[PDB]
């Protein structure tokens, strides 16, 4: 029942802010505070994987659509749980920061579009049948 | 060259002197040795380990499991702890 | 920081885990922090082809009693880089246990741990049954041997 | 191909090894060097049948699979007694006690 566009907009804005790059159905402020804390906690627990994806990425204007569609597919291939959604969000921040490192900043708008479309199409079904975002913040808080 | 290990029930076991030195306690006693507390069924197994150890140590051959019957384990354990092998 | 650990080299190395022992072999990999991690076991007499990386550390124990096993006639195994498309062989062979330790193995398997004291044995041997072969204990011993080197 | 043996007579047991190609007379000479008894004054048996000096250890039934170090094969020994020879007599080993109840699954 929450706008999935604001959730991904406010998240990539925070991931690009931690690197100092800046950027451009109600939504409560609590779902944003939990998603940032969970993504940072996820990154700390799997720092060996965070540096792994940041190196093996190799982002180009054409493989960017190839990398996103292949990684997100392999990420949810077993199923959909809240821990994999946090990894899904964190993977979006990885491909956005790595895009602006190689000075491909316009890809942030394309990645934010791909994340919003995948949430509304392939993940909106599971999130509703699990209490929504208000249940996700209760598992972490 | 051989030695004679004698069990508590009078059985005499003749093994090669090289194999008997696997037990450091047997080496200090050296000829013949009398074990007043190791019966024949236990001392015969100890001699079988001597021939087993000498053949398979420092060998790339596939090493088989050394069998030990359940009814002989406690006695063979005490016999091995004294012999240091 | 730890002494015995695997180097994150990320260089693939093909290994063959050949179980040349009557025991069910448990492969043990030492991660990049020296912690031992368990891997799928091997039935007696079987062999499996393994994806590993160069510069990693492997142990092999009995899956039921953690008894020490020799891999290529030693305790540790380090996969080197392959050549001519041949996998590096890791022959897991049974060691020549001392007659005492082999006796300790049979008694531990037959007598339950809470019944080691009800055995009419010496009090010293009672403490030898309770000292099960432990992987963390062998790591501390195999680390001090590298320091003496 | 090496076989591992247990030459036994009365309360004596000899632990030795030999090749399957080695003859029985050669095994008797091994007993000779140990017990100081000539091979002609010896009668070697397998189970219950008397072995001839011409046959090899393999031809009698001693193979590396049935004569391992951890479980050697038993050979009977008989010493010449006055004008005739010896009736085979191998005194058995001791009997271990009964299994304590802290061992039966």
Author numbering:
A (entry chain D): 8 to 31, 87 to 203
B (entry chain C): 17 to 46, 58 to 112
C (entry chain A): 60 to 208
D (entry chain B): 1 to 105
Task: Please share excerpts from the published article on this structure.
PROTACs are heterobifunctional molecules comprising two different ligands connected via an intervening linker. The ligands are specific for an E3 ligase and the target POI, and formation of an E3/PROTAC/POI ternary complex leads to K48-polyUb formation and proteasomal degradation of the POI which otherwise would not be targeted for ubiquitination by the E3 ligase. For our structural studies, a complex of VHL, Elongin C, and Elongin B (hereafter referred to as VCB) was used as the E3 substrate receptor subcomplex, as VHL is unstable when expressed alone.
We reasoned that a rigid linker would maintain the overall tertiary arrangement of the complex as 753b to efficiently degrade BCL-xL and BCL-236. Furthermore, another improvement was made wherein the morpholine group in the BCL-xL/BCL-2 warhead was replaced with a one-carbon bridged morpholine (1R, 4R −2 oxa-5-azabicyclo 2.2.1 heptane), with the intention of decreasing lipophilicity. A cluster of salt bridges and hydrogen bonds are observed at the ternary complex interface centered around the carbonyl oxygen of the amide moiety of the WH244 linker proximal to the VHL ligand. Comparison of the BCL-2WH244 ternary complex to the BCL-xL753b and BCL-2753b complexes reveals that the orientation of BCL-2 in BCL-2WH244 is completely changed relative to that of BCL-2 in the BCL-2753b structure and instead resembles that of BCL-xL in the BCL-xL753b structure.
